[PDB]
Structure 1
Amino acid sequence: QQSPLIQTSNADYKSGKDQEKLRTSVSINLLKAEGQIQWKVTFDTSEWSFNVKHGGVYFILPNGLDLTKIVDNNQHDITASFPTDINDYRNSGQEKYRFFSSKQGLDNENGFNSQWNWSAGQANPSETVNSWKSGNRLSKIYFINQITDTTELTYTLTAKVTEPNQQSFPLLAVMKSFTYTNSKSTEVTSLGAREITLEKEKT
């Protein structure tokens, strides 16, 4: 029910012998997929120095799934921390928890394409991830700023299937530094992605 894990990053020779570690820092693992899908996202923050200069993480959901619950690495249900209206003042850039939606806004600072470009679009995404974006398969981004941990962080996400004629569901997650950059002066950014397949329900 899950395709092979995709990991990409814009880390390059400037990161030296951490390049490969930075590239393979994000993982996604299906827990259960049976009108609901539940998955875990793991960010290995060990080589990122977020306790010196903070980073951020992003969870990207496809059209056809609506997030119902997200639990952080402290087992705290943070679902209600995210705005639901992209233009809410509590969704501005000073805020720790932010939400972006292709149904609400595309370009501008709180647009889904801008925030893609600042996250997965920066992480040298592969053709599979780029085809999800160009085919308008992806729609929501949940973002957490002020990540300062140095361990592996696991988030557990649950979503409801909203499209009854859909079997394939791309899931993605991204982490970056907001200070350290690659040789091209772009924030070091890494991604993890897998596609989930649901069995067709007989009716």
Structure 2
Amino acid sequence: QSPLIQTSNADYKSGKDQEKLRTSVSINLLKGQIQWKVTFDTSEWSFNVKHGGVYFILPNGLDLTKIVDNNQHDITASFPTDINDYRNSGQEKYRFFSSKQGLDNENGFNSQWNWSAGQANPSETVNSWKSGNRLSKIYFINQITDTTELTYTLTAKVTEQQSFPLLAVMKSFTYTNSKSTEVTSLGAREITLE
């Protein structure tokens, strides 16, 4: 695995929180299968006042088989498999987005990229992945109200390949930076299969 990438659109408007905000997302490889754990330092995000949301972003060649939340609850079956299932509406807590199923409109893969990682001032590398069409699934959880470190654990089967980008994104649905965009942070790592 590569070294950790972290970016955010957090700017001067957030005082001595700007850098804690930038570094809140981290990803660590754990183990024909890939397993990794995502940690969100929600400390300075004020989620308990007005909630946030998180995003898990998966590449081509990986298929989520298991996802466990910070309460060690297996929430895999909570996510839609059809993006147009009525259980996938904007109100719902667990949402799923897929490039195969659509790119544009509110539940479209590109729209959700734009509203998640796109907003986290992604470096050139993260943008290569999106632009090089190397990513295909987004898993989303609304209503994050925690104020501590949340850890999720994800397992996925390698369906195809050597390069495996893993991304995660957290943001506020209310607090914005100085250009009026939701404060949004990202962490990513490249896993290479030798």
Counterpart CA distance in 2 for 1:187 and 1:31 is 31
**1:193: Cα distance to partner?**
0.2
* Partner of residue 164, structure 2: 169
Match of 1:69 among 59, 66, 70: 66
Whole-angstrom CA distance in 2 between matches of 1:138 and 1:97? 19
Q: Counterparts of 2:131 and 2:68 in 1: how far apart (Å)?
A: 30
Q: How far apart, in 2, do the equivalents of 1:86 and 1:126 lie?
A: 28
In the TM superposition, residue 99 of structure 1 has moved relative to its aligned partner by: 0.2
Q: Which residue of 2 aligns with 1:201?
A: none
Q: Work out the CA distance in 2 between the residues paired with 1:31 and 1:143.
A: 22
Measured in 1, the distance between the counterparts of 2:93 and 2:178 equals 28
Shift of 1:80: 0.2
1:37 CA drift (Å)? 0.1
How high is the TM-score relative to the length of structure 1? 0.95
Supply the distance in 1 between the matched residues of 2:124 and 2:3 (Cα, whole angstroms).
14
Tell me, in whole angstroms, the C-alpha distance in 1 between the residues paired with 2:98 and 2:60: 10
> Matches of 2:73 and 2:162 in 1, distance apart?
30
Q: What displacement does 1:46 show?
A: 0.3
Displacement, 1:118? 0.1
Structure 2 length as normaliser, TM-score? 0.99
1:168, distance to aligned residue in structure 2 (A): 1.0
Shift of 1:176: 0.1
**Displacement of 1:174 after TM fit?**
0.1
1:142 shift after superposition: 0.1
* CA–CA separation in structure 2 for the residues paired with 1:128 and 1:194: 10
1:197 matched residue in structure 2: 192
Deviation track 1:55-85 (CA, whole Å, cap 9, x = no partner) reads: 0000000000000000000000000000000
Structure 1: how far apart are the matches of 2:91 and 2:173?
Answer: 13
In the alignment, the residues of structure 2 paired with residue 79 and residue 15 of structure 1 have an alpha-carbon distance, to the nearest angstrom, of 35
**Matched residues in 2 for 1:112 and 1:173: separation?**
15
Q: Percent identity, aligned pairs only?
A: 100
Where 2:30 maps in the other structure, the secondary structure is strand
Cα deviation, residue 123, structure 1: 0.3
Unaligned runs of 5+ in 1: 199-203
Which residue matches 2:40? 43
Distance 1:152 1:96 in 2: 19
Unaligned runs of 5+ in 2: none
SS of match in other structure, 2:112: helix
Shift of 1:42: 0.2
* Cα-Cα RMSD: 0.3
